[PDB]
Amino acid sequence: SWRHIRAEGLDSSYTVLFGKAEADEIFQELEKEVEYFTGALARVQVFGKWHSVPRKQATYGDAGLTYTFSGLTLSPKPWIPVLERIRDHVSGVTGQTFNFVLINRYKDGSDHICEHRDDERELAPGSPIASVSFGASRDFVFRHKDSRPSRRVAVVRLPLAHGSLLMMNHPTNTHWYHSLPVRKKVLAPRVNLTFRKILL
DNA sequence: CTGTATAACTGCG
DNA sequence: TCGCAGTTATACA
C-alpha cells in the first residue's frame, strides 16, 4: 500500500517498510555504525557565506563516485552491512538499483535542512531517490518553485515516520523544492537515508 | 520595468 | 513557535 503524492510536477510515493521492532533495531545499528563528516567536510557555501550544516551528513557508495552540492564535495565511504541491508530491501520493493547513499542525521528539532532540489549533474537522468527514515518522525515539506510568485500552487506537508520510505520520482526534483523545517518540540534524533544513482 | 540560481542565515510578523 | 522575505566573506549563461 503506497500513498501517492501528486500535484503539478510532483510524483512521489510514501509507504512504511518496517514495523517498530525492526526499525528500532536498524536505527540502533545506524547510530552505532554510521560515521559522519566533520569540520571542512561539514561546511557549505550559500548566498556568498560559508556555513556549518545544521545537522550531520555522511556518504557511502561505490568507489570512484562523488557528490557535490553547495560548494561541498562528499566522497563515499565503502558500503557497510546495515546500509546494504536497507539498500537491498528498498531495491526489492521498488525494482530500482542504487549505488550511493547520503545520510542526514538531525539530533533534535533544531537540526534541519533548508529547501533545495536534488538537481545536481552527477545524478542519473530521471532516476528516483529513495528516502528512508529512522528515529523521530519529522515533517517533510514539498514546495513548488513558482509559488515561492507567478503560481499559487499549494504546499505539500507530510510526516516521515520511523521505518518509512519516501520515493521521489521524476520530475519532482525539477519543479519542487523540499525541506525538513525546525520542529522545536522534537527532542529525539532522526536518521534519513537518501539512496541515489550517481553518474560515473 | 524586467537575466537565473542560490541545501544558509537574519530580520521580521 | 513557525514561516516568510530577503539575500549574495557569489557564480554563472
Swiss-Prot record:
- Stretch forming the signal peptide: none
Positions bound to Fe cation:
H116, D118, H178
Cofactor annotation comment: Binds 1 Fe(2+) ion per subunit.
Give the result of F69A, as annotated: Loss of activity toward N1-methyladenine adduct in either ssDNA or dsDNA
Q: In which tissues is it expressed?
A: Detected in colon, small intestine, ovary, testis, prostate, skeletal muscle, heart, liver and urinary bladder.
Question: What is the activity-regulation note?
Answer: Activated by ascorbate and magnesium ions.
Is this entry keyworded Iron? yes
Instruction: Report one GO cellular component.
Output: nucleoplasm
Name the coenzymes or cofactors required.
Fe(2+)
| Entry binding sites for substrate | F47, G48, K49, Y67, T68, F69, D119
Swapping V46G leads to an effect described as: Loss of activity toward N1-methyladenine adduct in either ssDNA or dsDNA
* Impact when changing H178A: Decreases activity
Name a GO molecular-function annotation: broad specificity oxidative DNA demethylase activity
Q: Explain what the record says happens when changing D118A.
A: Loss of activity associated with decreased rDNA transcription
Keywords in alphabetical order, please. Dioxygenase, DNA damage, DNA repair, Iron, Magnesium, Metal-binding, Nucleus, Oxidoreductase
Task: Summarize where 2-oxoglutarate binds, as residue positions.
Answer: N104, Y106, H116, H178, R190, T194, R196
Its annotated compartments are:
Nucleus; Nucleus, Nucleolus; Nucleus, Nucleoplasm
Known EC number: 1.14.11.33
Print the domain comment field.
Answer: The PCNA-binding motif (AlkB homolog 2 PCNA-interacting motif, APIM), mediates the colocalization of ALKBH2 with PCNA at the replication foci, coordinating the repair of alkylated DNA damage with DNA replication.
Annotated family = Belongs to the alkB family.
How this chain assembles, per its entry, is: Interacts with PCNA homotrimer; this interaction is enhanced during the S-phase of the cell cycle. Interacts with nucleolar proteins NCL, UBTF and NPM1. Interacts with XRCC5-XRCC6 heterodimer.
Job of this protein: Dioxygenase that repairs alkylated nucleic acid bases by direct reversal oxidative dealkylation. Can process both double-stranded (ds) and single-stranded (ss) DNA substrates, with a strong preference for dsDNA. Uses molecular oxygen, 2-oxoglutarate and iron as cofactors to oxidize the alkyl groups that are subsequently released as aldehydes, regenerating the undamaged bases. Probes the base pair stability, locates a weakened base pair and flips the damaged base to accommodate the lesion in its active site for efficient catalysis.
This protein is called what? DNA oxidative demethylase ALKBH2
The source organism is Homo sapiens
Instruction: List the top taxonomic levels of the source.
Output: Eukaryota, Metazoa, Chordata, Craniata, Vertebrata
Span within the full-length protein is 56 to 258 of 261
